[PDB]
Tab-separated table of N, CA and C in Angstrom:
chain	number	residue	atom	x	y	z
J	1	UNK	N	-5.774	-21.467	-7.484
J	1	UNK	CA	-5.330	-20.135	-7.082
J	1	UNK	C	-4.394	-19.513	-8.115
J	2	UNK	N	-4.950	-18.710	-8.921
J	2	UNK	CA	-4.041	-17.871	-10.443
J	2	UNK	C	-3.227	-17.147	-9.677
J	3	UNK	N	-3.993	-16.565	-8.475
J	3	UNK	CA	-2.864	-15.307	-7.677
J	3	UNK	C	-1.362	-15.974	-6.707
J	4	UNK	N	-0.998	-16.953	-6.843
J	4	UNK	CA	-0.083	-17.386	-6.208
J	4	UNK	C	0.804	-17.381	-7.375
J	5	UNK	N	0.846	-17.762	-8.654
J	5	UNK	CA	1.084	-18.049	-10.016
J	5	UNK	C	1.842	-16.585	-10.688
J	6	UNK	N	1.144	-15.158	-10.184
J	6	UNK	CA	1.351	-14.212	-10.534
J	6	UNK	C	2.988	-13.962	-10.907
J	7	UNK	N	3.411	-12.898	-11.147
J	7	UNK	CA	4.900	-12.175	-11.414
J	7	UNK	C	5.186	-11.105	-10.955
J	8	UNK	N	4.159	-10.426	-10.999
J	8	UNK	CA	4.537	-8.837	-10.573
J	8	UNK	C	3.047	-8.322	-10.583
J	9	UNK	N	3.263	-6.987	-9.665
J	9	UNK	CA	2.023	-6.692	-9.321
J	9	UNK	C	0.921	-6.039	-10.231
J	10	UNK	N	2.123	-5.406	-11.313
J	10	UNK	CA	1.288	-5.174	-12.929
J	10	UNK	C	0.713	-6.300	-13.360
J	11	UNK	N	0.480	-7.472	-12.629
J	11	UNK	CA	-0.954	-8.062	-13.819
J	11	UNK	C	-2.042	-8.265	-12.397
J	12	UNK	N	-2.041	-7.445	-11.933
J	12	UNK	CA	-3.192	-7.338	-10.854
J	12	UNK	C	-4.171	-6.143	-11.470
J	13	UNK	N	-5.294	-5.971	-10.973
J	13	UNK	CA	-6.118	-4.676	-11.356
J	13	UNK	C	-6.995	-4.330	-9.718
J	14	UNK	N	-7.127	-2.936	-9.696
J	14	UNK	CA	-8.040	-2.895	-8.365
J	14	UNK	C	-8.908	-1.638	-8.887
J	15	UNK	N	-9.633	-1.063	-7.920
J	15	UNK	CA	-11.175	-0.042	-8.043
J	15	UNK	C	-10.211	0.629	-6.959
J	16	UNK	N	-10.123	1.978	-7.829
J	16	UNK	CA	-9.688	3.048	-7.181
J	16	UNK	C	-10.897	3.384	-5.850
J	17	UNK	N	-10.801	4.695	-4.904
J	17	UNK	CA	-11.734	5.480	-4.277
J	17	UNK	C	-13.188	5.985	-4.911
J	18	UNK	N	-13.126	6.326	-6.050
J	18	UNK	CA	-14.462	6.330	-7.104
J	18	UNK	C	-15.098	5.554	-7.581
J	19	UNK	N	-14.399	4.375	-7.594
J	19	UNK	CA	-15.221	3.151	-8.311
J	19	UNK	C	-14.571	2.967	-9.271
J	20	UNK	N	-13.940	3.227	-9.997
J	20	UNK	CA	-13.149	3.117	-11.415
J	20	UNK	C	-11.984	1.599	-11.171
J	21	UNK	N	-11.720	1.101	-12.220
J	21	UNK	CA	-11.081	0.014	-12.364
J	21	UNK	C	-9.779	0.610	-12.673
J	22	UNK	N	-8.493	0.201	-12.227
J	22	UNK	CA	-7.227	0.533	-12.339
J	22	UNK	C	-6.204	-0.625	-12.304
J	23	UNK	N	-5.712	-0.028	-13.929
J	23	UNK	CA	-4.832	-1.870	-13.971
J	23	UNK	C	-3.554	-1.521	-13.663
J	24	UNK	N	-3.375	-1.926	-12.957
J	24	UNK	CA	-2.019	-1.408	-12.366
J	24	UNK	C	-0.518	-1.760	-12.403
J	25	UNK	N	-0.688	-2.469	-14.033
J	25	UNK	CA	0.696	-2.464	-14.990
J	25	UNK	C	1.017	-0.624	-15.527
J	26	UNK	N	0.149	0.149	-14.734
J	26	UNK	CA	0.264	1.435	-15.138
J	26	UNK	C	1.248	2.301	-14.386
J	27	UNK	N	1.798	1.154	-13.468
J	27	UNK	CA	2.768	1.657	-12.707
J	27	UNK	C	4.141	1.292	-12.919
J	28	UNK	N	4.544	0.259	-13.942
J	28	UNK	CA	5.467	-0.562	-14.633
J	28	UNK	C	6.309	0.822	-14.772
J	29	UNK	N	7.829	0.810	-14.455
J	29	UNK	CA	8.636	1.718	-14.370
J	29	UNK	C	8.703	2.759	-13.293
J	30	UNK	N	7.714	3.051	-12.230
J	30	UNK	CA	7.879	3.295	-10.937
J	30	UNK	C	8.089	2.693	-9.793
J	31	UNK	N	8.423	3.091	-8.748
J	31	UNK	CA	8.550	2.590	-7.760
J	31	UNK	C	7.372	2.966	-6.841
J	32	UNK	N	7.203	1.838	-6.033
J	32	UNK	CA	6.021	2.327	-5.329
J	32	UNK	C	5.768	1.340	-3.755
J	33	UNK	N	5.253	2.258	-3.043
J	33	UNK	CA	4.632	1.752	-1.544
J	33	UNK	C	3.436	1.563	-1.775
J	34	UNK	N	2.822	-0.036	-1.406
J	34	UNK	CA	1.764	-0.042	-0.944
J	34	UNK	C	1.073	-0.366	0.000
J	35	UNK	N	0.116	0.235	0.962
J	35	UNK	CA	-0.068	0.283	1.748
J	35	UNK	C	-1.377	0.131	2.517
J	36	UNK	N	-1.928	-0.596	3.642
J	36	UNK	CA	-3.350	-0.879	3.889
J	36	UNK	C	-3.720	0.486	4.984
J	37	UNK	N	-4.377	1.206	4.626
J	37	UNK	CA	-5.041	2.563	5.767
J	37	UNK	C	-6.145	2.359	6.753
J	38	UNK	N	-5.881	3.530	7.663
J	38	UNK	CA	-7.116	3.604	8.267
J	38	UNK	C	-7.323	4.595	8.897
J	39	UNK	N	-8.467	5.328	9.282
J	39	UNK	CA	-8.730	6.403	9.555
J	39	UNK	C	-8.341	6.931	11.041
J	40	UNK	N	-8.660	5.870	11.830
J	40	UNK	CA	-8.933	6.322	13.305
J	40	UNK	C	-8.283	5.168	14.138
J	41	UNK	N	-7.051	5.223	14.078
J	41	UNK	CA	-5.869	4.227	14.156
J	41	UNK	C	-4.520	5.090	15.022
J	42	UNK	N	-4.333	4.477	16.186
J	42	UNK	CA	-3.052	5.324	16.869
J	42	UNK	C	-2.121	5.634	15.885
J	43	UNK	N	-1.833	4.869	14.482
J	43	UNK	CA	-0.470	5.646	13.596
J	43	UNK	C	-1.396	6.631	12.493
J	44	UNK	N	-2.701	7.072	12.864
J	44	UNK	CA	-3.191	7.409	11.053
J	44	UNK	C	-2.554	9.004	11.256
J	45	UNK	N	-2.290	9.505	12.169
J	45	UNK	CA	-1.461	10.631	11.565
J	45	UNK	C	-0.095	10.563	10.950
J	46	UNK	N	0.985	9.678	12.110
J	46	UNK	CA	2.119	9.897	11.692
J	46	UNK	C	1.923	9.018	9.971
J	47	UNK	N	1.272	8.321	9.721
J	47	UNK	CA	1.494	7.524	8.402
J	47	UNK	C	0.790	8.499	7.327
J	48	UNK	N	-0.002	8.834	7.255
J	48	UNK	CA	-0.686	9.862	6.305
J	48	UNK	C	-0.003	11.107	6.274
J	49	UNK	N	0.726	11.809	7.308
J	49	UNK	CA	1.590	13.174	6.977
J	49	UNK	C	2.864	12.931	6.368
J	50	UNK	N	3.400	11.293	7.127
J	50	UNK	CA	4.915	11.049	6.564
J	50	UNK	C	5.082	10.246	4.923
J	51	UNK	N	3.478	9.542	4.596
J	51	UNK	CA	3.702	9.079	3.307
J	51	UNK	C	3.192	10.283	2.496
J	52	UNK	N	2.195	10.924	2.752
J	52	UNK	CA	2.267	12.592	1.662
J	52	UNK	C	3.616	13.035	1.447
J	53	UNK	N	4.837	12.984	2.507
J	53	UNK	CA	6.090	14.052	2.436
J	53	UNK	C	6.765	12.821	1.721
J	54	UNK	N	7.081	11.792	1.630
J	54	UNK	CA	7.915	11.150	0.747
J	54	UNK	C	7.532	11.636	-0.276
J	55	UNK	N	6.205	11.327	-0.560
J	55	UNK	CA	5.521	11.546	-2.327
J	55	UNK	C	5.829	12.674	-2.779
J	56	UNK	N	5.504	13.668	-1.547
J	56	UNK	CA	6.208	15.021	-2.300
J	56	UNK	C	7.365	15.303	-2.660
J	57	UNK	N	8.626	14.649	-1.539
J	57	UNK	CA	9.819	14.451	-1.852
J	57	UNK	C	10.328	13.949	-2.769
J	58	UNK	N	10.132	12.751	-3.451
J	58	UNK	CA	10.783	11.985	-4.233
J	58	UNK	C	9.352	11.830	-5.725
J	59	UNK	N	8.600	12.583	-5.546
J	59	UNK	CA	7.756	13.046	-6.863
J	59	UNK	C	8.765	12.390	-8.304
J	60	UNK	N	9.292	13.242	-8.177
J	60	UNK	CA	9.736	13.628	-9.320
J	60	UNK	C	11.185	12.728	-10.045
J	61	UNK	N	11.304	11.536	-8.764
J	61	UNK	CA	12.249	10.718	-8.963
J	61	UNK	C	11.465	9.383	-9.213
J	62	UNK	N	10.023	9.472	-9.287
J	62	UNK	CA	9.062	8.533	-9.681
J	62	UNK	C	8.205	8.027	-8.815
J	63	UNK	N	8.400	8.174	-7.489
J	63	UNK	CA	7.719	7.565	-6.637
J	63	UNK	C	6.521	7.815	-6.874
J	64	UNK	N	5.575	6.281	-6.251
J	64	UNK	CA	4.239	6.476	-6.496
J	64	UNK	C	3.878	5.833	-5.553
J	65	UNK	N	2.469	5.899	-4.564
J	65	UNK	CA	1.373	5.654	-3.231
J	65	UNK	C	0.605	4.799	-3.445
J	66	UNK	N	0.432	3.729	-3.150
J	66	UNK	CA	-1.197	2.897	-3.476
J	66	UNK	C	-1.366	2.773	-2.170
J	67	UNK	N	-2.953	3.171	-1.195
J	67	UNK	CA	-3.907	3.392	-0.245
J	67	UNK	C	-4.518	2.345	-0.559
J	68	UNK	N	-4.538	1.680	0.267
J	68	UNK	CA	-5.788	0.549	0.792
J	68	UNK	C	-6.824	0.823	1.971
J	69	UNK	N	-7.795	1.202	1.586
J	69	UNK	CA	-8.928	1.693	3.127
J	69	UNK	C	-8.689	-0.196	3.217
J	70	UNK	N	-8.839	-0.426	4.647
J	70	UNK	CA	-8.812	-1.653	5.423
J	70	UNK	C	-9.471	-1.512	7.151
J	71	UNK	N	-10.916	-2.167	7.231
J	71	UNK	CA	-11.658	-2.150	8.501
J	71	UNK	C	-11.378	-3.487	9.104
J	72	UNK	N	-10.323	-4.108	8.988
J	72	UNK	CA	-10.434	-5.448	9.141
J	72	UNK	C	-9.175	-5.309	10.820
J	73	UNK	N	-9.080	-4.266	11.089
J	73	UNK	CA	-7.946	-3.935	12.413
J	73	UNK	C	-8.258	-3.358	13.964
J	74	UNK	N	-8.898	-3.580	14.453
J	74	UNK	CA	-9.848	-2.848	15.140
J	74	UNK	C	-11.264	-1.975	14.655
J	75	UNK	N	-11.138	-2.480	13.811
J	75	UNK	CA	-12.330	-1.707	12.911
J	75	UNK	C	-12.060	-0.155	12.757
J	76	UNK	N	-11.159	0.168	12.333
J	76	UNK	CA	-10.697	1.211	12.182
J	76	UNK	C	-10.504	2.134	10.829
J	77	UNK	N	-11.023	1.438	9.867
J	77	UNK	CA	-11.722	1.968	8.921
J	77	UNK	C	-13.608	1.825	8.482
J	78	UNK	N	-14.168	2.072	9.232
J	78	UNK	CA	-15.556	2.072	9.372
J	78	UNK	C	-16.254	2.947	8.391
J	79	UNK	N	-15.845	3.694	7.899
J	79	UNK	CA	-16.652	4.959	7.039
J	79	UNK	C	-16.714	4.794	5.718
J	80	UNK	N	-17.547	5.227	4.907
J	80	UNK	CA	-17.694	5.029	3.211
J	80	UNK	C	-16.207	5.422	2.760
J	81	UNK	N	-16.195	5.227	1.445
J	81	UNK	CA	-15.351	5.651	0.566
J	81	UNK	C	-15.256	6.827	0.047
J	82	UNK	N	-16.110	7.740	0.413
J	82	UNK	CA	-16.220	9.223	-0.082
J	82	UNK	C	-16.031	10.172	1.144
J	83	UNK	N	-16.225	9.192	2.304
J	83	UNK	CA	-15.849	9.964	3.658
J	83	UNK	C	-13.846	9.590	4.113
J	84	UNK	N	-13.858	8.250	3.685
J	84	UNK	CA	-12.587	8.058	3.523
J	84	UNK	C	-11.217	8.802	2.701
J	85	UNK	N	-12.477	9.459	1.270
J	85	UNK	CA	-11.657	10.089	0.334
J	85	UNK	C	-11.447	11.880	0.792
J	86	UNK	N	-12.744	12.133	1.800
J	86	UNK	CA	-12.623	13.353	1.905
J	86	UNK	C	-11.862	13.659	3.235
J	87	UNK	N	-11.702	12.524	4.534
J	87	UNK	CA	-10.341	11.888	4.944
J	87	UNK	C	-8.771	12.349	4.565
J	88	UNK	N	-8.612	11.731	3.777
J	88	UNK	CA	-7.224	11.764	3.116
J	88	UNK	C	-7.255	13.384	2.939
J	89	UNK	N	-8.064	14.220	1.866
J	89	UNK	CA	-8.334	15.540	1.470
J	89	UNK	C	-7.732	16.037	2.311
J	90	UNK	N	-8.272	16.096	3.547
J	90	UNK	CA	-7.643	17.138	4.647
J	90	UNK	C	-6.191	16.608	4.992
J	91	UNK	N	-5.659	15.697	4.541
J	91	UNK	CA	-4.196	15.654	5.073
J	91	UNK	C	-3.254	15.768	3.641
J	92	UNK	N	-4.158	16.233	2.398
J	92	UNK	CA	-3.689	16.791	0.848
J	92	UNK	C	-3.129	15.797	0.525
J	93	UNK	N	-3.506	14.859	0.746
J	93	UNK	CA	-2.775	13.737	-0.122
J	93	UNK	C	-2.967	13.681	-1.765
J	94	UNK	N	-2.153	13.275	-2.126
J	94	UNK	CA	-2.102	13.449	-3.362
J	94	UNK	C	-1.706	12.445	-4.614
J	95	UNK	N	-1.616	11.046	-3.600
J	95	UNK	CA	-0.985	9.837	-4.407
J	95	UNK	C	-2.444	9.109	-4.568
J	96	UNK	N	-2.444	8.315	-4.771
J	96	UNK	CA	-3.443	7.365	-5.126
J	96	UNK	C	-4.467	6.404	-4.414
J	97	UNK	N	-5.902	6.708	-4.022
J	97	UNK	CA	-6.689	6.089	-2.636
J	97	UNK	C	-7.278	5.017	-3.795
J	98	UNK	N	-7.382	3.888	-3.488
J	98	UNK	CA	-8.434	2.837	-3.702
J	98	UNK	C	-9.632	2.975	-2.840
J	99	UNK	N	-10.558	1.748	-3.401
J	99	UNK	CA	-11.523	1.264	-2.693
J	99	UNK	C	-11.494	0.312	-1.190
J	100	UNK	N	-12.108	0.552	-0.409
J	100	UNK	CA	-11.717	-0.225	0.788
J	100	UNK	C	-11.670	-1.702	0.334
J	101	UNK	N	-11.051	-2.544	0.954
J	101	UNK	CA	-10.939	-3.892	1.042
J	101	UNK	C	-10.584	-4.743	1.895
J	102	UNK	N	-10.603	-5.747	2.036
J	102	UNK	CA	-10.014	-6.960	2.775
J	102	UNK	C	-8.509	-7.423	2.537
J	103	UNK	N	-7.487	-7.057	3.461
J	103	UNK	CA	-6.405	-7.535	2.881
J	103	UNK	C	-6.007	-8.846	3.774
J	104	UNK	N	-6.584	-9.538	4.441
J	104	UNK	CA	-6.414	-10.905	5.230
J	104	UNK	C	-7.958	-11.794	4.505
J	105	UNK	N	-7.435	-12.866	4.942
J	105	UNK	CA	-8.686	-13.974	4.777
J	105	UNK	C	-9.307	-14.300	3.524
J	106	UNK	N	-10.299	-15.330	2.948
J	106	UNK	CA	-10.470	-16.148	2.014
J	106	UNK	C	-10.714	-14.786	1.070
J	107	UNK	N	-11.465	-13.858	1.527
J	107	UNK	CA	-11.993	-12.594	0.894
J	107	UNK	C	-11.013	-11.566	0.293
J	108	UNK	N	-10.043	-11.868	0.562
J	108	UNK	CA	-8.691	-10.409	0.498
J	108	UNK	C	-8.704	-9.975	-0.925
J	109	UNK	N	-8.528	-8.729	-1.201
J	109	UNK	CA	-8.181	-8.525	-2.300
J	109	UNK	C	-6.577	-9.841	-2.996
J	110	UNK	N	-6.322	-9.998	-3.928
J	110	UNK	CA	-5.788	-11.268	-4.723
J	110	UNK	C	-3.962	-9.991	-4.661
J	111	UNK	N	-4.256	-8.768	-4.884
J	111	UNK	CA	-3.193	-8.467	-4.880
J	111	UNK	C	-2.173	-8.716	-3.443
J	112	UNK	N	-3.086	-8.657	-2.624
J	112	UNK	CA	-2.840	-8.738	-1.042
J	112	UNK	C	-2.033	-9.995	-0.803
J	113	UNK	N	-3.034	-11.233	-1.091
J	113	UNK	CA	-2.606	-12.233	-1.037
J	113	UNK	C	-1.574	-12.232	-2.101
J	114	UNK	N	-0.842	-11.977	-2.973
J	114	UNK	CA	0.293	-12.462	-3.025
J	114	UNK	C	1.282	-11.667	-2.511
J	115	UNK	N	0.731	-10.180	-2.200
J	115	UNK	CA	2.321	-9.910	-2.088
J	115	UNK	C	2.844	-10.440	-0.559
J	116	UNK	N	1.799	-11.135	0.184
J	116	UNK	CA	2.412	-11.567	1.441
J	116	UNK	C	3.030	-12.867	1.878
J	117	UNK	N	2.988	-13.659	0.355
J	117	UNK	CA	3.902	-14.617	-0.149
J	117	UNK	C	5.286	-14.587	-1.233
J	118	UNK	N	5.112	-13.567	-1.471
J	118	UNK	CA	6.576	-12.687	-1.892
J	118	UNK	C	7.522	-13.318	-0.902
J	119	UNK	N	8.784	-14.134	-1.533
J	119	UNK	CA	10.287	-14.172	-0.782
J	119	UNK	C	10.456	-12.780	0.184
J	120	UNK	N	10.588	-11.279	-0.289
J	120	UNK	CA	10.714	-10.583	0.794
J	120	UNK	C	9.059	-9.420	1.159
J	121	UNK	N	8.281	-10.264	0.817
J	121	UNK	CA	6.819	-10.053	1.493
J	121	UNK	C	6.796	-10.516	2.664
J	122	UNK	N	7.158	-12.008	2.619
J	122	UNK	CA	6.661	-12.814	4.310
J	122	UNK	C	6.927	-11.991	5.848
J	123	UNK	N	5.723	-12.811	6.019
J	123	UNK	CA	5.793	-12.150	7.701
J	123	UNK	C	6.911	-13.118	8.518
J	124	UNK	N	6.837	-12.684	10.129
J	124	UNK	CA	7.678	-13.480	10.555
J	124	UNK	C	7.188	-14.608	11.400
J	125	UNK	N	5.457	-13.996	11.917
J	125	UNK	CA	4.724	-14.400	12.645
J	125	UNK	C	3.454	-15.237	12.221
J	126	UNK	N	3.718	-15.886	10.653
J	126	UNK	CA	3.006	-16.558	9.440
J	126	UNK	C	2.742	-14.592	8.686
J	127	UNK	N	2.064	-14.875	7.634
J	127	UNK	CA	2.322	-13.946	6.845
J	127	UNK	C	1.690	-12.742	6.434
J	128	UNK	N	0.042	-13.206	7.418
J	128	UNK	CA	-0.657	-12.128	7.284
J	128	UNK	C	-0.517	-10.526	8.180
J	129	UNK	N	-1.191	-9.844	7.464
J	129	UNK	CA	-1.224	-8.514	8.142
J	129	UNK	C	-1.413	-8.746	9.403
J	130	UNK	N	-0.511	-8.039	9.982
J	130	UNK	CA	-1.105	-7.802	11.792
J	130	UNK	C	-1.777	-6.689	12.156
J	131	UNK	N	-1.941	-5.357	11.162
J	131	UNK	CA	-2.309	-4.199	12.102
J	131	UNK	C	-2.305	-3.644	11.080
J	132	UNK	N	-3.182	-2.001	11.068
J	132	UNK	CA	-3.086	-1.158	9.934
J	132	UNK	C	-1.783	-0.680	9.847
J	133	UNK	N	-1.735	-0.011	8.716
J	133	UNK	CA	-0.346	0.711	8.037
J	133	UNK	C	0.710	-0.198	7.802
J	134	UNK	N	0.720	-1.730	7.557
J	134	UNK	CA	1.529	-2.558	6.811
J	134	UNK	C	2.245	-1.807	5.593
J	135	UNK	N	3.549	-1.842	5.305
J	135	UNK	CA	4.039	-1.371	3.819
J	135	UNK	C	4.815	-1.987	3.311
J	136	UNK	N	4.414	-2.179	1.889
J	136	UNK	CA	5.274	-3.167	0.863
J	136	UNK	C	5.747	-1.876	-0.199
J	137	UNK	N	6.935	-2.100	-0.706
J	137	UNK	CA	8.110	-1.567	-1.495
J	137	UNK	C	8.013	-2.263	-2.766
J	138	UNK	N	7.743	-1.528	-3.837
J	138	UNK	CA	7.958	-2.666	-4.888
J	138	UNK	C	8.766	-2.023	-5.817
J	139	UNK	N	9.053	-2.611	-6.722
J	139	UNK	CA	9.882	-2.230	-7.113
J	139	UNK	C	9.437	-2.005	-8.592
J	140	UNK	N	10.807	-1.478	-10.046
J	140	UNK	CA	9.906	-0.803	-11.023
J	140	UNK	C	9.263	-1.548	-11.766
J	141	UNK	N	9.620	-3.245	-12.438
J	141	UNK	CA	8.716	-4.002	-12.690
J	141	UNK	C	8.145	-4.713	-12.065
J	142	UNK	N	7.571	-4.053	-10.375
J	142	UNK	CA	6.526	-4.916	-9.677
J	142	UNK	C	6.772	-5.704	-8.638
J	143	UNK	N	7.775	-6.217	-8.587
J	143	UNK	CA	8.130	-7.331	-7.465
J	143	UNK	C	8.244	-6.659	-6.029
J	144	UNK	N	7.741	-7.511	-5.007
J	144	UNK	CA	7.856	-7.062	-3.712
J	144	UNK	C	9.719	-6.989	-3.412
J	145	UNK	N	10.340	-5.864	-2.720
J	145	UNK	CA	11.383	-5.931	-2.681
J	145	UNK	C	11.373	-5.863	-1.133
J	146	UNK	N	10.673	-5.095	-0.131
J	146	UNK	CA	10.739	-5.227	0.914
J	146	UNK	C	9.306	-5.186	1.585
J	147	UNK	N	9.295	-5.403	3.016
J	147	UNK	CA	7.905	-5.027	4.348
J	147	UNK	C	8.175	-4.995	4.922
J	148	UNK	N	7.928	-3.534	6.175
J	148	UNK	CA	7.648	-2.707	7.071
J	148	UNK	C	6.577	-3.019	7.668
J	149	UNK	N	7.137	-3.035	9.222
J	149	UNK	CA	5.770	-3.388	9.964
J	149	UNK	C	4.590	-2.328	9.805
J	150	UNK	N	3.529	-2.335	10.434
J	150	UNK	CA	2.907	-1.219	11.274
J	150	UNK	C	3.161	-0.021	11.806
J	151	UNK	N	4.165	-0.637	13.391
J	151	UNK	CA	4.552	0.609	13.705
J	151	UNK	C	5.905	1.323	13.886
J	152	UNK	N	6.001	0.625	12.110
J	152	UNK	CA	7.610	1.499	11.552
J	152	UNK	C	6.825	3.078	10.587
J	153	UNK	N	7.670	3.983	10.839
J	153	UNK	CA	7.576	5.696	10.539
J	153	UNK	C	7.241	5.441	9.190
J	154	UNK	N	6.634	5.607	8.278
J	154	UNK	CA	6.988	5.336	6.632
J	154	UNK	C	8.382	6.492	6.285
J	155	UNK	N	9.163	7.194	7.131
J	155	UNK	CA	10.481	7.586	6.847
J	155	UNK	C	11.234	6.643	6.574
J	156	UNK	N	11.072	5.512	7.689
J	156	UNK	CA	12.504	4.616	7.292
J	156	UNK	C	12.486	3.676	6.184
J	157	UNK	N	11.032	4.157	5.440
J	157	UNK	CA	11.543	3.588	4.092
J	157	UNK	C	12.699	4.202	3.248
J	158	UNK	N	12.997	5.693	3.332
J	158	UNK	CA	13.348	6.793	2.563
J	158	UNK	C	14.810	5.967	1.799
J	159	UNK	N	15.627	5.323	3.511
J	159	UNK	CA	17.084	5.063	3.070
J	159	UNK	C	17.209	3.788	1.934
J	160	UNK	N	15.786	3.427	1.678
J	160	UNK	CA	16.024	2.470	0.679
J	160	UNK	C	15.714	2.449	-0.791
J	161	UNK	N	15.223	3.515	-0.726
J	161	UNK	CA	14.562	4.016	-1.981
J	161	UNK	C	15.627	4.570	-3.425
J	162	UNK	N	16.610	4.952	-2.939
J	162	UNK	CA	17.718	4.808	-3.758
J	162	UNK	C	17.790	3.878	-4.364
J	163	UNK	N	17.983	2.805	-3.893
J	163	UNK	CA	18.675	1.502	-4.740
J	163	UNK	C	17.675	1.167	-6.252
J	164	UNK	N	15.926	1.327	-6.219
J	164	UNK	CA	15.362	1.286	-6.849
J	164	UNK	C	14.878	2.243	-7.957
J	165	UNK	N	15.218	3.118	-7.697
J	165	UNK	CA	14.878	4.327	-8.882
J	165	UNK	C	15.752	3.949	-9.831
C-alpha cells in the first residue's frame, strides 16, 4: 500500500468532471476543503449553497473546493458526470468538480484512503465515511488539518480558516 506511505495530498492525482487528469500538487500553497457530494441527499442544498459562499468569500485569500461525486450513501449520487456537472451549474459553483468515485472500500479513490488515516483525518466510529458531505481541511502543503462530519453546515468551517492562510 504506497498510499498509506504518502505526505501530503500534492502527490496524489485525480480526473476532474471532464475526464482530464489533475495532479493536485497544483494546489501546494492553498488551502483547501475536500469534500465527497451528492445530488439528492437531505444536506445537498445547505452544502452546495454554503461551500459556493465560502469560495466566494475567502476567493481571494486562497481558498480552494475539491467535489467528489460519491453514490456509495444511499445511492445518492446516481447520475453521469455531465448531469452531475450540469447539477452543480445551477447552484454556480465555481470551485472544482471531479469525477465520481468511491471514497470507502478496497475500490476508493487512494486519496480517500489516506486522508482518513491522517492523525486529524480519523473517524471516531473506525474511520470510514459515514454519509455524504464528509469534509477534510487541508492545509497549504497538503496535510489533513481537520474533519467535519456530514451533518456539520460547511460554515463552521469558516472560524478555522484563519489559522491556515
Amino acid at each position: 500500500d504506497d498510499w498509506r506511505c504518502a505526505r501530503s495530498m500534492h502527490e496524489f492525482s485525480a480526473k476532474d468532471i471532464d475526464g482530464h487528469m489533475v495532479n493536485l500538487d497544483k494546489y501546494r500553497g492553498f488551502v483547501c476543503i475536500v469534500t465527497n457530494v451528492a445530488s439528492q441527499c437531505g444536506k445537498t442544498e445547505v452544502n452546495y449553497t454554503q461551500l459556493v459562499d465560502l469560495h466566494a468569500r475567502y476567493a481571494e485569500c486562497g481558498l480552494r473546493i475539491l467535489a467528489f461525486p460519491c453514490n456509495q450513501f444511499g445511492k445518492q449520487e446516481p447520475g453521469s458526470n455531465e448531469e452531475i456537472k450540469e447539477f452543480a451549474a445551477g447552484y454556480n459553483v465555481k470551485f472544482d468538480m471531479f469525477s465520481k468515485i468511491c471514497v470507502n472500500g478496497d475500490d476508493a479513490h487512494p486519496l480517500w484512503k489516506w486522508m482518513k488515516i491522517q492523525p486529524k483525518g480519523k473517524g471516531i466510529l473506525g474511520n470510514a465515511i459515514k454519509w455524504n458531505f464528509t469534509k477534510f481541511l487541508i492545509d497549504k502543503n497538503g496535510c489533513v488539518v481537520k474533519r467535519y462530519g456530514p451533518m456539520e453546515e460547511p460554515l463552521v468551517i469558516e472560524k478555522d480558516l484563519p489559522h491556515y492562510f
